[PDB]
Structures are given as structure tokens and as C-alpha cells.
Amino acid sequence: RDNIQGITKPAIRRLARRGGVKRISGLIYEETRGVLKVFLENVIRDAVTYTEHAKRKTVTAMDVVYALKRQGRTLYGFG
Amino acid sequence: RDNIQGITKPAIRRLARRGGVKRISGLIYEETRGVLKVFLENVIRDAVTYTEHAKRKTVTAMDVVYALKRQGRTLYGFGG
Amino acid sequence: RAKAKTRSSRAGLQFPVGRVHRLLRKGNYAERVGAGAPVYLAAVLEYLTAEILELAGNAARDNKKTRIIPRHLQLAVRNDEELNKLLGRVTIAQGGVLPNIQSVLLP
Amino acid sequence: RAKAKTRSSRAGLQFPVGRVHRLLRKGNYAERVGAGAPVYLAAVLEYLTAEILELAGNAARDNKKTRIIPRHLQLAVRNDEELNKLLGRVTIAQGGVLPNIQSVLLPK
Amino acid sequence: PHRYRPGTVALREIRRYQKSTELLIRKLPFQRLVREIAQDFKTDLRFQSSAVMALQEASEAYLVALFEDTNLCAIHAKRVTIMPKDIQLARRIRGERA
Amino acid sequence: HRYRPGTVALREIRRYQKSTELLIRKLPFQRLVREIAQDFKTDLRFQSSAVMALQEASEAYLVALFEDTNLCAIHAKRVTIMPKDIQLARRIRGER
Amino acid sequence: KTRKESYAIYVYKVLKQVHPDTGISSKAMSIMNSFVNDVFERIAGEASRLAHYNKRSTITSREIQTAVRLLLPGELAKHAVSEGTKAVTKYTSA
Amino acid sequence: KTRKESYAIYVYKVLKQVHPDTGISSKAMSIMNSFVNDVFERIAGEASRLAHYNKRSTITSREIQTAVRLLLPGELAKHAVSEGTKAVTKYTSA
Amino acid sequence: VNCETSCVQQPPCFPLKIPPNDPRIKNQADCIPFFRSCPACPGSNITIRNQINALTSFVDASMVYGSEEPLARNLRNMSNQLGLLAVNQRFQDNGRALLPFDNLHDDPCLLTNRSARIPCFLAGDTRSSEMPELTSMHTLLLREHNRLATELKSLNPRWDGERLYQEARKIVGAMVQIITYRDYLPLVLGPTAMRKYLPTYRSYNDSVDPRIANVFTNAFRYGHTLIQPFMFRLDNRYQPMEPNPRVPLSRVFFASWRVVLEGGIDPILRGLMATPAKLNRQNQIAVDEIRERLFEQVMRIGLDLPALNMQRSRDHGLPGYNAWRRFCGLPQPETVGQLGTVLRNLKLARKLMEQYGTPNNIDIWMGGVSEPLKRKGRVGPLLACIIGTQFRKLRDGDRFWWENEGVFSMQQRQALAQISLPRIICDNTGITTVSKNNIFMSNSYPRDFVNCSTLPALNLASWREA
Amino acid sequence: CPEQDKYRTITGMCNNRRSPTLGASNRAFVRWLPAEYEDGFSLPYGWTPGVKRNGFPVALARAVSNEIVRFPTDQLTPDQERSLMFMQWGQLLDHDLDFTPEPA
DNA sequence: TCGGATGTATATATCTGACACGTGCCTGGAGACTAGGGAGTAATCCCCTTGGCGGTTAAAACGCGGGGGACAGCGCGTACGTGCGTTTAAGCGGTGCTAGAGCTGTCTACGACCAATTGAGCGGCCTCGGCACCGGGATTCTCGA
DNA sequence: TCGAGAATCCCGGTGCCGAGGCCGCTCAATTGGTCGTAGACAGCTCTAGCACCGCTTAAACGCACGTACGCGCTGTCCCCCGCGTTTTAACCGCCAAGGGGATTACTCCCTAGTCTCCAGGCACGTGTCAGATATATACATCCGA
Ligand code: HEM
């Protein structure tokens, strides 16, 4: 399952344009994919631990909210 | 009353040497003094608030530790 | 007995002083909660809510809209120094980002 | 009755299980505190203390010193990845910094 | 045959995607990536739709902030092109890869 | 006899990264701390441990900021640290 | 079908005080509820720590006031304090 | 002078267990005590939040295990968890 | 060419014309008297006309000491060396001081009561004798300065008269600043406008303009919408005291005999602390004793205060409602629906539309008092904008700001941060029971009144010089 | 202006050292907008009858007060959160800051 | 690339002050019950999460021409490090003082807890209009000379 | 500074689904009384923070010089950008299933609370042995000859 390539080069370009990036080097996409993979791994691991404690098989939006809060990344709009 | 100048240039250069810096510019020192004043202002304001809530006239080291922990800058070796 | 009067009306607030007292009592904060602590907390919460609601409504009105969406709340929060400092590590979902382009990137 | 065996002696730990339970009950954490939370917390605290003290003693031995000073604790913390991650926002008084020099600044 | 200069469509996209609020990553590939990553921790997991959207919003906000810091790093080096070393420097100063 | 530039600077780096002693005179730091705290309270008294903790925290903070500043200077293909590296480090850190 | 309590009507009442013509959406309602919960928890935790530091078993308006002073940045805090003070005064009047 | 308690004796006992020939100073003792206090506070707070999130009114060893998993990074956590579990197991044996 | 008796619109007089079917005046030839404000540079056909602010823009207690050298010199006590303010040599309020009388060619204080023959009260402003309550506040501040100078002299015998007077003036100005910026303004602008327009003080910026805007003199008139219909006096028991516990306000304007010969200022201050103001509603803009019954005795007809305000806005050449909305990032209505949305009222919007014709034609005063009040404030968003911006310019542009370094010592600053208007009232009147904190917010006895022996007095011990 | 001073002057003089005359008493007002007179500089809107403002006639101020401001006095609503202290301090603060003189 | 030339880790004494230890006692943890309510365990309802089909078409991808900017020379001005001699408070060690932190005793008053009553708020159900939607007409930001 | 082509702004109908209003009712908030333990107040004790005083003296300060580095300019090319065509799958709209989230009833076992007591741990006092402090040595290491 090589789903990390699902985040295409135009998608990373759009995220950079929202961030104010005008020119992008060709090797940026792999680095951005690695950074996104690391961040998602951390947040999803925390959220899966939160789900595991609740003895649930479904990751709820509250689990993600608490996982983000534990990292100083509070998210509003989902509880 | 200009006690921020008590942070001398040799002291700042020693701090930078401890910080792995080989070469320094001449405008670094005033910037360092301003940054230090801002940091000390924040920490001391929090510590004085903690002291005032206790109705005490002296500022204990534990108030400083609480202030630093509030800024996310836990300090070990003083208090508990 | 006399007619019941809610504590929020006694304090002149809309946020529930009774429910705030209940939350402080079972919130695992201290053994005892004073009679003026819930009133103070409710007043502070109502003040902050009024601040953000006023700013978000102004943002929506300048956007020529009748309702409030998360974009307006994000614009309200991020355009205010004190509110941005308070909500500095806070993400508002579906709120986007503030438009900002670096000077040297312009033609 | 019987001889007052400390709960830590039964658990085989060097940290006070009873004192930990007392600080858990009076800490305003929950309405109730279980009988396994003190033992778990004491074990975790003792393990972390043992690890940092072992590394600090190694650092002191490498510096031909008998007593441990804060420099040895700082060297122990900053030479371990997990301890540096756990204590990333922690300042140790009189501990100094790790000796690092950028390769660009080295003579050539 | 009208052709803009190589530095105009990028700025137009910058202005276009900074005024919008939509999610800039396709939802199906992002959901597949999230499920693939979560397969490392638990198997046969289920995700609420709200959970996946929350993860997507958080990830997009994080990547936008990281790209702003990376832009600052690249500008500091008297550049306009975003290079990987700028990402590494931003993550190191932030305390992420430090 | 004379040493070429950058030699005694490296010697200072090696000698000061070894010692853990505070690198600021204690009396001027006490005076600065009292001067700052005067604006918040009247006739404030300070323990010795309070000012000592303030000094330790301030020195550690300044050293870490200087490490970040040196990294920023290295990024721009330079050897001397400048105030703009300090500002960039503070911005990326989030203190600004 | 549980009676899920939230600050929906209260935020709506404040909104009608501020913007009667202007309404609010579901996502903005969720964001306002999340913000209110977050600030409540922040102030409550700071007040609990303040009470524990001084070996006090109770949380009063003094602990809440000092928590507001510590947490809320700048003039925000001051304004909040004023509001709280006034409320308590009114609550003492009747 | 009233009694003031600290983990100093237990820290010294652990040190003597680890390095019998190596001593400790007083500033290092203060550092160790502050470290123990800080880790205790972190784990206890995380356990309290976990208990609150689940509409529960008791802090148990499951909450403490989840707190250790959440706070301690990587390999440390694993070992720590094992240590914790072992302790509880012994306290269940006698 | 007297506006009080002539109706021809000839400079410098520009009056108000009576429309047909007027409830009070049945004559079309009759007009409401009006005066055009003095131009800054008369006789110049190129420079745009503008007005002059006769008092210093800063919050320096200019109502107690004045803003001119002869007036400030005449307000002092030159018969001794204690640095006191000139006081009354003929009457006293139960042994307490009163403002000195002033000699005016046209003294209107004698018009209200021809038997008392009590003149007006002299103070730092010409209009100090407007109402008995304003006179009461002026007496309070003069007494406070005198008492402060006496206490400083007792504490520091080495100080001379001039130093004592200057120090007391500084402390009184700081007191006015603290009261205004800590109690009044949050209750005017509300928390939101006060926070947005008057943020945390940093330092004295010397490039910030400290002048008073021309709009402020017609946007701070929002207080004309809280003038209660009657004047209230209370006794020591805070009960309606006879004779005349409630007086029609048309009979109390410009009357100083009600202060001189009715037990001083104690009943008037007691009524001020224990009488609620008039709420501003979109249907009740101003009471009829100021809209129709203003200044009966001093002139030949009652005056229309709202009409005066709008006419002054027209004469000052202020831009309409839409432009002042365009300053503050607020939408500018153009049609009836937009005005109904902005003003939160449909009938009011229709009446305004019929009267004026465009939202751009709306006067600043009528528009400001038209839109609903801000939350916890008594002004609309545009008025809150104007007032907050003006007060921020006044504060940040003051070098001698009480919080600015080099004006008051840090110990002196903490001594000053403990003042309150009820404390001044208690220290300078016979009133024993005084309102609680935020005297501007307490109106009902004994719900929000306390025995004022518990309020700590000002500590001048930090003012000792060795 | 003196190089040093410990107290404010009577006229607010020398508070701003770069611009002494700015901020003092008897000084002209400042304008955040250019003045919109009837003719632009001299005539107030409504001075000359029949001269429309921006294309529409100038309303009579007394008529505006009659139709909009006027209300039956008996329907007065007291302010339950403010007292006459608020009104009096407002008038005192006016007498402090601003006062526009008019000819006798 | 050696002679000295500066700096320093090291082997050998030398006080010294602070840490490891012995001791008294005291107060908090341990043993032993009892009472009650929180959650552990089933059991049911539905809802919302997953898999699938199918038509649209929006977007991703491949290719290609070209231009601009990233990076490697190259030099010049300057300012920062290095060494030296003068000055200045840092530090230390004693000295005395009293402001306030800390402990103790009284007392009262205020919050926890209980029982009775009712209404504020929350969920479910219409309902209409704010707005995202589809043409379509201006409006212009830009590029190439 | 002006045509061509393109991106965006902004009008006008459309209907649609989401926000707002209304209706029951129930569980939580209010009203009325007591208890007693926490906190406010007053008083006494004795640390320890505070303010000179005198002597070294380590270090801060300021200067002369030159070498290494920051700054800027020049040239290449190749890597990035924008457009045209084609393909690929994201997306929307049912269709169906069913596994798990959420709710409800019973109980029983684990936790709070109370009473006694005794021993771990805190504060005290001490001496002796690692450690900072001199001193000469043998290296450790840098700069033109
Ligand atoms: C309570 C009785 C009051 C009376 C009788 C009164 C009377 C007046 C009058 C007659 C004028 C001049 C009208 C004109 O322009 O021709 C005036 C001006 C003004 N009023 Fe009031 N007023 C009162 C209260 C207030 C209050 C409470 C405030 C503010 C809170 C206020 C603010 C002002 C201001 C700012 C001016 C402009 C100064 C000037 O034009 O000289 N007034 N007042």
C-alpha cells in the first residue's frame, strides 16, 4: 500500500501556495511527504492510544481532538 | 537605573562561546540585552503575581520556579 | 416558597452560573468551591464569548453575509493580537489562513 | 495486628507507595484513586530515576570524579535520545551544555 | 499564443488558495494514507468521517505553517526557491527535528 | 608572538563549553532583576535562591538562543552571527 | 437521544445581544462551544494550581481572579477581571 | 522547624543500588527531586484527563499505563510500562 | 444681531427654523436661538473653517485648575504659603469649603431665583455652574486638592507653597486620569470597544497626535440621552427629603442657590449616587425637559438639546453618517433596507429616510444616538469608535501620564492606584454611607451602599522627601 | 520650551517637544475628515434654503427632533445598570477635555 | 615545519568545608473494619461505516520550449579577534538590624449536604429564505513591443 | 504605453437544504436549614534579607593592527514553470449490509472514612576525606624561517 504517493505533487504545490511559497525545488515533494508521514504517525498513534483506552474499535473525532491537544495542537470545530 | 548595561559585552561573548559561536557581529549585544529583558520581564511578572496571591512581601525561589513552569521552561535544582 | 430566581439573573449574566458551579464542583479542581467563584468564571466566559462573537459578526458583515462561518471566526481570532496570543496553539477547522505574501516574492 | 509493612516493600520498589497514594488522593485529580495507581506511578518514577542516575554515574566515572555534580546529570540527559526528548523543555541548573562545534567553524 | 511569465501563475495561485477555506488535498487519497498509517498501530480499525476530516484539517494547517517557516528560512538565505535544507532548518529551530 | 584570528575564539569555545559556572556577574544581575521587579511591586524582597534561579534560567535561555542563531548563520553561508539570525530563530521558535 | 448539554443557547443569547440580525451556523456553533470549554478548563486548572500552592482547600474569586490574570494576555485579562468583579458584586447585592 | 519532605532518601537508595562507589552532591539531589516531582505531576495529570474523558470518577492503573504510553517517548515508555506492570503484579501477589 | 432675541440668519448667527405644526411653538416666524462656533482663522477665504478647543486636550484636571495663566493664578490661595485653592469667603457647607464666586456682566445664576441673589461658581471651566450636581463635583475636587495639600504640608513641613500646589495639582490630575480610564470609559465604550481602542499602555509616543477631533465635540454628546427628567436630593437617611425631594429639571438649570442655601452639596451628591440614569432607547431619545424645556429662566424660550446638537454638527461642517461609518470599517447604508439593518429598527429607519432622504444626509449626532447601544456600553459602534480613538490619542500622547516614567515614583504610583471617587466624597463631605466600587454603576440604596469607614484613604507617606 | 520641566504647564505647553504648539489650549481642532460644508469651506449644510445636499434637500433640525427624538415623558425608562454619577462624570470629563467657544 | 611561544593536562602537596552518618522523636502511613455508589457485565436499537456499481468530468500526468535564478569564480573594504596596559567594582569576610516568614491559639461563618418543587433547556418537527448554484456582462491583471 | 487572451468580479433567477421558531417534558437548578471545619484574625519567635565597610584583585575597558570574512558583481546552464493532450480516478448518487456506538438495568466489589499506634523520616550535630587550590613539568598545539 504505497498510499503516500496519493498526495500528488500538485497537492503539495497547493499547500505551499496557501503557505505563500512562490517557487518550489524538485526535491521538496519527497521531504514534504516525509514530514507529513512523521506528523501523521505521531498524531494517529496518540489518537489510537486514546481509542484503545476507551475500549473502542472506531477512531472518533474526540480521540483526534485529544491527540492533537496532547501535542499542543488544539483543534476547534469537532468537539 | 540603566542596569541592563550590567550585562557586559565580555559576558555576552562568553555566553555565545558556550553556545558554540566562533564569530560575533557588533550589533548582537543590544539584541541579546533586549531579548534578556523581555524574558526576565515575563518571568518576573508571573513570579510577582504568584507572590502577591500568597500575600507575601518577599519573592521566593518557588515563585520563580512556578513562573518558569508556566512559561513552559521547567527549571531543576531550585525548590521542588 | 418564593418564586425561583436563577443565579445567572441574580448576577446579571446569560451563561449559567449554576451549571458553571456544577462543572467546577465535579471538575476535580479543589475540595470546595466558593459562592462567588462560579459567578466570576461565568462572567469571564461570557465576556470572552462576547468578544469573539462581536469580532466574528463584524467579519461576516464586512463579507456581506448574514450567518457566521468558521472562516469569519478565524479572521476574527487571527487579526487580534491578544486573541491570537490566547489561541496561539489552536487550529480553527475550515477557517483557512490569513492572506500574506512575502515582499520579495512580488514582481 | 501485625508489623507495618510499607506497600513499597511488598512491591519491591525504592519509592514510597503510601506517600504517592497520599499525593494522588490530595492532588485534586479524581474523586477516587485506585490501589494500583500508586504502585504503577512509584515504579515508573523509580525506573526513570534509576536510568538517569546510571547515566550520570557513567558520566562522572568518565570524568574521574567520585561525587555526582549537575554537569554529570546534564551530560547524562543530553547524550540519551529518549531522556533528551522527555526533558526537552527542562533546564538543569549548573549543568552547562554539550560540547559541540560546527564543522564549518573548524580550522581548515 | 499567450504565455505568462514563470512568476505570475504561482502568485495568482497564492492569492487564490489563501482566500479560500477548502481542503487542498484530495479526500480519498488522504483517507487511504491515514488508514495505511493507522494500520501500523491497530488492524481492522474503523474511522469516523469526522475523525478523518479532523486529521485532514490538522495536517493541512501543520503543513501550511511549516511551509511559511520554510519560506522564511529560504528567504533568509537570499533565495526564493524552497529547498529541503530550509525545511530541515525550520524543523530544527521549531524543536521538531532538534 | 601572535595567533591568527579564530584560534583563541575556538579556544574559548572549548574552555567555556566545559565549565558549568555562570557566565554573568552576580551583583549586576541582582541589580537588573530588582530593577525589573520594582515596576510590579513596592519594597519587594528577593531570596538568594530566587535570583540564582532567575540567573540560571536566563543564561540557559540565552545559550540555547545563541545555538539557534549560529545555526541560522550557518544556513546563510556565513560564519558571523547577526541580529537577523536572532530574529529568525525567535520567529521560527514562536517567541516573536 | 441524550440531553447533550452545551453552550448553544448562551452563545446564541450573547450573539443576539451583539448581532441580533446576524445568525450562526453549525460549525461556528461547534467552534464557539470548543473555545468556551477550552478557556473554562484553562482558568479552572490555573486556579486549582494556585489554591494547591498556598495549601488552600477552596477555590474562591481570588483564585479565579489570579488565574485570569496569569492566563489571559494583556488588557484582555484586565477586562475579564472587571467583568467578574462586577458580577460578584451584583450577586452579593441580591 | 516543621518537617519538609522530599524524595532525597529514595533517590540516594536508588543511586547506591546503581553506583555503590559514586556519591551525589546537594544541587544534584535538588535536581533529582525536581525531576521526580515533575514526572509525577505529568503522569497524574494525564491520568486525570483520561478518567474525565471517559465519564469515570477513578484513576486506576489502566489510566496510569495509558498516561505512561502517551508521555514517555519510544523505547523508554516500553521499559517503563513493563516496570510499572511488574510492580503492580507483585502488589497483587502480596 | 443678538441670537437670543433675533431670528434672522446672519453671521455669526445661524438659528433653527420652526417647522409647521410644532407642538410647542405655534408661530412660524419664531426660531430656536443658535450660535455658530468661533472660526480658527476668521477673515480667510482660502483656508477651510475650523473650530478652537479652548481647553488643553489632556486629562490634566483642567476643570479644577483651568487652562489659562490668569485663571489658574486666580484659582489659588495667595494669602498664605500652603498652596491651597481659592475658596468661598461668604458661605460654607456645614464648615466645608465652596467655590469662590465670579463676577460676570451677564450672571444667569441670579435669574433662576431673584430672591436668593446667589451668583455662579468659579472654577476651571466657564460652565461649572451648569447644574447643582456639576457644582457638587467641582466642590468635591477643590476640597480634595485642599485637603491633599494640607496633608502634604503636615507630612513634609519643609515644602513651600508653590511646590505643595504643584504636587497637589499633579496628584489631582493623576486621580482624574485614573478615575476616567478605570471606571468611566469601560462603562461608556463597553469592554470590546475599550479593549480595541484603548489597549495596554506601552510608553509615551511623541509622534501620536494628542489633539481633540472636531467630531468628538459632537460624538461625546451621547450623554445628552441619559439626562433624567428630575433632580433628586436625599437626606442623611437616603430618603426623599422635603421640601421638593424631586424637582423639575427646567427649574434646576444654572441655579447655584440650590447649592448655597440648601445645605451645601451633600443632598445633591447623595441623590447623584442614589438615582438611576435614563436608558437610551430608539423610541425615547431625549426627555422633553431638555428637548422642549431647556433653559426657561435664562432666556426667552425653552431649548431643544437634540436639535442644538444636530445643528452644531451641521454648522461645524462634520461629514454625514456614511463617511464616519467609512472611517471605522463599517458598511455605509444607501437604501431604506440597509438603514433598517444597520439601525436594527425599521420604523426608525423609515422616519430617518423620510426626514433626510439619503443615509449620507444623516447628522452625526442623530445617527450616533440612533443605532443601538453596544453590549455593556451606552454608545453605538460609530460613537464608540470615535470616543475610543480620541481617548487613545489623549492617553498615548501624554508625556506626563500617571503611568509614564519620570512623572510619579513607583511607590507613588502604587499609592495612586488605590484611589476611588467614593473615598474623595467621604474625605470631603459629611456623607457617611457611600456607594460601592464603580460609583458610576451603583444607583439603589441600600442595595449597593456601604458604611465608608472601611475604604482606605490615600497614603501620602510615600511623598516624604528627605 | 525649557530643556527640563517637572510639572505640566498651565496651557499644556511643551508636552510634545518636537511640536510645542501642538496639544495646548486655545488651539484649533484636528480633523479626521475634510470638512463637508454646503459650499465646501464656508456655508453649513442648510445655510441657504433650497440648496440641496448631495442632490437632496437639507432637513430641518427641529423637525428631525420633533418626528424622531420626541416621545411622551411618562414613558421614561430608568437605567438599571448606571446612575446619575455616570452622567455627571461625563459632563465633568467634557468640561475637562473639550469646550468649543461661541460668540456672546 | 622548527624554536620558542603561549597554553594546558598532569603529577605532587595542602587546607577545607560539606556530605555521609549517628540520634531523638513525632506524625503520618499501616492495619482493621463498615457503608455506599461506580462501574463491570450483559442486552437491545439503530446509525453510520464499508463495500460496490456506474456515469461525469476534474484533475493528475507526460512532454516540451524557454528563461531566470541558484551556484560557482573573483575581488575589495572593513570589522572583529588578539594582545597589551589601565581602571573599577566583583567578590569576600565580617558587622549589626529589624521586616517579615512561620508557627500557634480562638472563633465564626460559609460551603457541603439533604429534601421538596418547578421550569430551562434539550430533542424532535416543520418551514421558509440565505445562499451555493448556473448563465452572462463588465473589469481588469498581464504579456509582448 | 496599447490589443489579445485569460482570470476574476459581480449581477439576475432557482430551488434547496440548513438554521430558526415552536411544542412537551424531564432532569437539573433553586429554596430552606444545619454542621463544623476551614479560614480570618491576633500574637509571639527568630531567620535572613538588607545596608555599610575595607582589601585584594580578577576582570572590564579602551586602544593598535591586520587578517579573514561579508558583501557585491559576473557568467552558465539547467531546473523549474506554464501550457496542450490524454488518461486516471475523485466524486457524486443510490443500494444494501451489518458491526459497532450509544443506552438501560443489576449488582458487587472497591474505594472513602474512621480509630489506633508505631516506626520511617526529618532536623540536629560532627568529623574526615574528596576537591579546589598552588607549583613545576612535559606535553599540546600554532606560525613564519
Ligand atoms: C445633564 C445635563 C446636560 C446639559 C444641560 C447639557 C447642555 C449642553 C449644551 C446646551 C451644550 C451646547 C449645545 C450646542 O452645541 O449648542 C452642550 C455641549 C456638550 N455636551 Fe452637554 N449637557 C448635559 C450633559 C452632558 C453629558 C452627560 C455629556 C457626556 C457624557 C455631555 C457632552 C457634551 C459635549 C461633549 C458637548 C460639546 C461641548 C461644547 O459644544 O461646548 N453633555 N451640553
Numbering used by the authors:
A (entry chain B): 23 to 101
B (entry chain F): 23 to 102
C (entry chain G): 11 to 117
D (entry chain C): 11 to 118
E (entry chain A): 38 to 135
F (entry chain E): 39 to 134
G (entry chain H), H (entry chain D): 28 to 121
I (entry chain N): 113 to 578
Paper text:
Here we show how myeloperoxidase (MPO), a highly expressed neutrophil protein, disassembles nucleosomes, thereby facilitating NET formation, yet also binds stably to NETs extracellularly. We describe how the oligomeric status of MPO governs both outcomes. On the other hand, MPO monomers stably interact with the nucleosome acidic patch without making concomitant DNA contacts, explaining how monomeric MPO binds to and licences NETs to confer hypohalous acid production in the extracellular space.
The MPO monomer–nucleosome complex (the monomer is composed of the heavy and light chain that originate from the same precursor polypeptide by proteolytic cleavage and loss of residues 107–112) was refined to resolutions of between 2.9 Å and 3.0 Å, and its structure closely resembles that of the rMPO–nucleosome complex (Supplementary Fig. 5a; root mean squared deviation (r.m.s.d.) of 0.88 Å over 1,608 residues). Indeed, MPO, like rMPO, uses arginine residues Arg473 and Arg653 to bind to the acidic patch between H2A and H2B. Thus, rMPO and MPO both bind to nucleosomes identically, but only MPO (which is a mixture of monomers and dimers) efficiently disassembles nucleosomes. We acquired a dataset of such a sample that contained only two stable molecular species, free nucleosomes and MPO monomer–nucleosome complexes. Consistent with our biochemical findings, monomeric MPO and rMPO lack the second protomer that displaces DNA from the core complex and therefore do not destabilize the nucleosome. By contrast, monomeric MPO does not clash with the DNA end and therefore does not displace DNA from the histone core complex.
